[PDB]
Amino acid sequence: GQSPTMPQGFSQMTSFQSNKFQGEWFVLGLADNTYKREHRPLLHSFITLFKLRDNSEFQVTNSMTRGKHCSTWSYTLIPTNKPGQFTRDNRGSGPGADKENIQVIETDYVKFALVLSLRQASNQNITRVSLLGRDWKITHKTIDRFIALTKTQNLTKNNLLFPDLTDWLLDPKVC
Template structure:
């Protein structure tokens, strides 16, 4: 009987592993960068500063997470060489988590790659592209990374404040759908006060 139970457990584990693999294998393909706009006449100094993550859309984002997706902030600090020190502050497990990285400018203004990518051996490539911004109210930023043999992409809707007008959110949803995403891949964050205003 013990052998039978062990066999059943191993079979169930195999099924669960297969289902988990299937859910990541069915990613919506990342669009070509030709399909992703780039903010014309990008102004690095005007883009720097604190942004709140109001919305998120991506091929690994799930609508079921929407009510649990807490707002976080990301601050872009422009350096003399044109790169940004980028610090995100998240409230997790009743404490403030800091995630710091560097975005290095590429040949086109408004497009960046992840600095010191060798520190992330699982990531083969990482592209950041500012697709639209008015610098004072909102920004939409496209991220694409290749990890292993999978390509993930997302669009982040940033706000200088924690609330954005409905027309800005509608523009974000339309843009996400133009990249092949559906309503099931688009979520908005729950505004919070802990940590993210530091």
Template sequence: MQATLLSILGLALLGALHAQDSIPIQADFQQDKLTGRWYSIGLASNSNWFKEKRHLMKMCTTIISTTADGNLEVTSTYPKGDQCVTRNSLYTKTEQPGKFSYTSTRWGSKHDIRVVETNYEEYALVATQISKSTGPSTMVLLYSRTKELSPERLERFTQFSREQGLTDDEILILPQTDKCMTDAA
């Protein structure tokens, strides 16, 4: 019985590792071109917090800058009720350009972050595999340099999210807002 359970757990772990390895990373990733202001246009996730908060979510701004040691500082400002909330995250670079790690001590989670594709001037598609004690989850973000993107880019985000196993009710094009959009770049 115990051996069967261990082999099932082993297969599940191998499956999870294979799933992470199947997520592509932008070829010839150029980190300096990713810096600057972005708007979060789309968000897809199978996490419980997303399911609970999805109806409250709006577009937000994200400023990406490079730290002295080559990591990414990611500062997102979003509307929450009648105020603007800013969240800072430090994405630690890995040996593979375009792949980062982040640990949230607040939520007890580890994040494997991959810049899947970008043209740096218009959009960026980012996939995150999240591991925490309550189980794994997947998140896909669509960033844009402007508050609007072409239907083709929106469809690519939806298609990629589905490829990651997310369902249509786990995929959200964030409603536009002017609230909290005037932070300094």
């Protein structure tokens, strides 16, 4: 695996502040080569949190409450030798230990985070891009930054799914 599907209009962060990237992140952008627009995400926008596991491993806890029924899952992102390059540790697995490569191309804790992900599922690798925000009131200026990723990752406009977010009072429910 020496073909890194990463943006050519951006540059990986030479200094990745792990202790600064941690916290809550709303998903304002979701693009995936194996995604379906009519079978789009179970929600409009999920809340994925990043906890400092050991030194830079991110415990990605995705909170997706569908109605009154919530589902939360946490994984551990393992940093590589590259600044801002991770992989979902699936060492506690064997048969289906398909891992997922996470790479933060452009994060800014005050506004947003451009995160790239490629899940190697053996049969094929899934290229997925996520546009995370500190808050959901992100603008198209910030959205466009994610669009650039979708372009470089060769993800068609069909793969681009954006949160409707006409109403988000998902607080006094669960999770």
